[PDB]
């Protein structure tokens, strides 16, 4: 009855350094409805994350983005952190430049 | 090309206090134009889109007067559905919704659709014909009884194949500068080693408009789905969307691989090659 996420971690524009970019953490495929989703900085939460509203697809599964502004630099390392009913642990996924 | 106007109704109940949460939203093919939400302080449906802010106080009033009626029946459903399949009062259900219609190249109505689900799983649907419906259990076959009773169908179709495609249509007209424009993906290929036998090589669609693509790789001319991955199409944030798909291939070997690119945007295929 219930649906796991799935989660891709991204930028909204091609990533460099010292310009303004946006980090994206897409999340679908998940049901119920209801999921916790942060941007981390260094491991560390970031406080203003906007998202989409909710919708869903074809086989009745919800999917949202969430996404913050940010400045890549070589040293910060970004990650999205997220909990659902069918999740034990929460799940953290890189971002990768390359994915 | 084809369109579509598509609204998606998501109503979750709330055990110990108060109406469920519910949130709809509308789009014009690929492009959210309104939403709805019960936690939000406007109570109106609110525009998503520039090209809807045209519409006037009495298109905004119609559509709140709407989509809170519908707020309302799905209100009644959770209560009906509890009931139906003898589910205590401590647990929070879903239920969903979806309609719309989809034209041709001509804006002429091609299908129209209805359909409904509880707690993720099929409940009722019309069928094609827009006359009948889909019942997938006995509960779902009593309200299929209530809504023939009512001629329930009748009126959906009228909505669909009328009322549905001309709105369609003035949407695509005043949004015409962005919902009429084909964006083509800015396509690249990535090279990287996991070994000194084996590399990966990745096709990248960029900054696309509608979402629907291909990408497909062959070796040697040949379609090849072996030692492949693709990432389901995401959305950018700025209205358009990404995908890639990877190949892995033996080093030094990576000339014979060719990713193709397909979209409505392209007028022929693309063929990229490192
Ligand atoms: C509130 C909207 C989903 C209503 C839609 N415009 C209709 O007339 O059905
Ligand atoms: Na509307």
Redesign the pocket.
């Known amino acids: 009855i219930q649906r796991t996420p799935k989660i891709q971690v991204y930028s909204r524009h091609p990533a460099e350094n010292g310009k303004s970019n946006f980090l994206n953490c897409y999340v679908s495929g998940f049901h119920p409805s209801d999921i916790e989703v942060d941007l981390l900085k260094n491991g560390e939460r970031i406080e203003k994350v906007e998202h989409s509203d909710l919708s869903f697809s074809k086989d009745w599964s919800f999917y949202l983005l969430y996404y913050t502004e940010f400045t890549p630099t070589e040293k910060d390392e970004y990650a999205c952190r997220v909990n659902h009913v069918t999740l034990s642990q929460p799940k953290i996924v890189k971002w990768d430049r390359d994915m | 090309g084809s369109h579509s106007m598509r609204?998606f109704f998501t109503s979750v109940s709330r055990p110990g206090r108060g109406e469920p949460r519910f949130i709809?939203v509308?789009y014009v093919d690929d492009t959210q134009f309104v939403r709805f939400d019960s936690d939000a302080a406007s109570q109106r449906?609110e525009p998503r889109a520039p090209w809807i802010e045209q519409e006037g106080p009495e298109y905004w009033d119609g559509?709140t007067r709407?989509?809170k009626a519908?707020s309302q029946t799905h209100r009644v459903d959770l209560g009906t559905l509890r009931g139906c399949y003898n589910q205590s009062e401590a647990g929070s259900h879903t239920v969903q919704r979806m309609y719309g219609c989809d034209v041709g190249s001509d804006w002429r109505f091609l299908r129209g659709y209805h359909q409904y689900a509880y707690d993720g799983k099929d409940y009722i649907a019309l069928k094609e014909d827009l006359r009948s419906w889909t019942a997938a259990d006995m509960c779902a076959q009593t309200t299929k009884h209530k809504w023939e009773a009512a001629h329930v169908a009748e009126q959906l179709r009228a909505?669909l194949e009328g009322?549905c495609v001309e709105?369609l249509r003035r949407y695509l007209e005043n949004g015409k500068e962005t919902l009429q424009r084909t964006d083509a993906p800015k396509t690249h290929m990535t090279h990287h080693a996991v070994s000194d036998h084996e590399a990966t090589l990745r096709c990248w669609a960029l900054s696309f408009y509608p979402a629907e693509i291909t990408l497909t790789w062959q070796r040697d001319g040949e379609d090849q789905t072996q030692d492949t991955e693709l990432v389901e199409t995401r959305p950018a944030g700025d209205g358009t969307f990404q995908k890639w798909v990877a190949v892995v291939v033996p080093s030094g070997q990576e000339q014979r691989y060719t990713c193709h690119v397909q979209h409505e945007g392209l007028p022929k295929p693309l063929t990229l090659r490192w």
């Open positions: 609204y709809a509308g449906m559509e709407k989509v519908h909505y009322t709105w």
